[PDB]
Amino acid sequence: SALFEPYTLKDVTLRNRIAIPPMCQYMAEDGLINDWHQVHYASMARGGAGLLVVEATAVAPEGRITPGCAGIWSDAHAQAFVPVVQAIKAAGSVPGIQIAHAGRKASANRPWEGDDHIGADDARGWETIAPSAIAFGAHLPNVPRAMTLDDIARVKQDFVDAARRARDAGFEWIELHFAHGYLGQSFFSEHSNKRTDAYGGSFDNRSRFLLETLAAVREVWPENLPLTARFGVLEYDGRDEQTLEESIELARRFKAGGLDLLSVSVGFTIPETNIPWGPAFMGPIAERVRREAKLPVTSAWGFGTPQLAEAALQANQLDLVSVGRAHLADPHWAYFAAKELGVEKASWTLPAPYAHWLE
């Protein structure tokens, strides 16, 4: 099975090609994770996935999506992750983290508590920041404050500090969240970036915040540990071929800047889109990015069937398959996939106190 071959990138070796992508739990308090996250992550790691990327973890308080998001904007915040790192490692999986800044999609309610921007009169909310003072719209109508040059430098330094802390906490894999309509994605997109200084206009200027943040993080993040990013390479906004061509050139520039792997996604920059959801629908996009930018990739959004994961790998569309929601449903999904694909001694994808009895 391709899905259960190991993967080596820099000095990290993953025991198979199953990655758990970052999935916000909205269960933190003032950025501090807790018992909820400890069991959630340790249980999934024991399930057998080779790589577990911890949810979007805010580099700054205002960079949270919700009052429940994890943060890493202080050393105390970082120290809370150590037991998660240790549990993921004890289960044989590799611990990663996604560091993030929600940009104009910040100050929102939890998804099951309205999923919408927090109102002005609710004290739990805060002012958001973005490249330009333009709202997403729809359920997120709040207009962000356009970032100053000092703002741009401060946030780049929060990403550096976040990466410094993740390193020191023991993570072996980092992912910069430049996707899904949050701060980084909104600098790259013409939809959201109307700046007239060095950080807007041309392709080079729209690229600048992302490339400078990459470069700054690269300085503190070990060369022997994978440096990755997630990026939305198209929006399904009717501008797909031009957007894709530009996104692939920026990925060429990420590679020149030392990126080891790109997690390929959708922009979600604006609500006025027509995304063709379906099983493995990102496969061909991911493949194009991989081939044209000459960079390993993962992706998500449907691949959560064992035959779809296996297929993508064999067609060299992906190097890792990210499987999210199926792990929410079953934290032992990797074991289910091993059984489905006829892996030998499939029950031993799980630790012994389980594997002995299931074989």
Ligand X SMILES: Cc1cc2c(cc1C)N(C[C@H](O)[C@H](O)[C@H](O)COP(=O)(O)O)c1[nH]c(=O)[nH]c(=O)c1N2
Binding site for ligand 531 (CB under 6 A): 24, 56, 65, 180
Q: How far apart are CA 300 and CA 23, in angstroms?
A: 12
**Both tokens of residue 295?**
């960079």
* Rounded least distance, CB 188 to a second copy, Å: 27
Exposure letters 28-52 (e unless 16+ CB within 10 A, then b): beebebeeebeebbbebbbbbbbbb
**Both tokens of residue 27?**
């269960």
* Rounded least distance, CB 158 to ligand X, Å: 17
The answer to whether the annotation marks 301 as part of a ligand binding site is yes
* Rounded least distance, CB 68 to a second copy, Å: 9
Cβ-contact 302, 278 below 8 angstroms: yes
Q: How far apart are CA 143 and CA 145, in angstroms?
A: 7
Q: Which does 205 bind (CB under 5 to 8 A by kind): ligand 531, a second copy, ligand X, none?
A: none
By C-beta, is 193 or 299 nearer to ligand X?
299
- If we measure between CA atoms, which residue out of 229, 216, 103 comes closest to residue 174? 229
By C-beta, is 48 or 296 nearer to a second copy?
48
Interstrand relation of 174-178 and 297-299 (parallel, antiparallel or unpaired): unpaired
Q: Which does 149 bind (CB under 5 to 8 A by kind): ligand X, a second copy, ligand 531, none?
A: none
Q: Which of 26, 41, 182, 335 is catalytic?
A: 182
182 is catalytic: yes
Q: Which does 176 bind (CB under 5 to 8 A by kind): a second copy, ligand 531, ligand X, none?
A: none
By C-beta, is 40 or 206 nearer to ligand X?
40
- If we measure between CA atoms, which residue out of 191, 198, 11, 178 comes closest to residue 103? 178
Q: Which does 38 bind (CB under 5 to 8 A by kind): ligand X, ligand 531, a second copy, none?
A: a second copy
**Both tokens of residue 224?**
């022997």
The answer to whether the annotation marks 226 as part of a ligand binding site is no
* Rounded least distance, CB 100 to ligand 531, Å: 6
Which residues of the chain form contacts with ligand X (CB under 6 A)? 21-24, 55-56, 98, 177, 179-180, 230, 300-304, 323-326, 357
Q: Which does 229 bind (CB under 5 to 8 A by kind): ligand X, a second copy, ligand 531, none?
A: none
The answer to whether the annotation marks 56 as part of a ligand binding site is yes
The answer to whether the annotation marks 359 as part of a ligand binding site is no
* Rounded least distance, CB 120 to ligand X, Å: 26
Place of tokens 């040059």: 149
Q: How far apart are CA 72 and CA 78, in angstroms?
A: 5
The answer to whether the annotation marks 69 as part of a ligand binding site is no
Q: How far apart are CA 357 and CA 54, in angstroms?
A: 30
Nearest residue (beta carbon) to ligand X: 324
Place of tokens 């109508």: 141
By C-beta, is 58 or 295 nearer to ligand 531?
58
What one-letter code names the amino acid at 161? D
* Rounded least distance, CB 344 to ligand 531, Å: 22
Cβ-contact 290, 321 below 8 angstroms: no
Exposure letters 105-140 (e unless 16+ CB within 10 A, then b): bbbbbbeeeeeebbeeeeeebeebbbbbebebeeeb
Q: Which does 65 bind (CB under 5 to 8 A by kind): ligand 531, ligand X, a second copy, none?
A: ligand 531
> Residues comprising the binding site for Ca(2+)?
127, 143
Residues carrying an active site annotation = 182
> Residues comprising the binding site for NADPH?
24, 177, 180
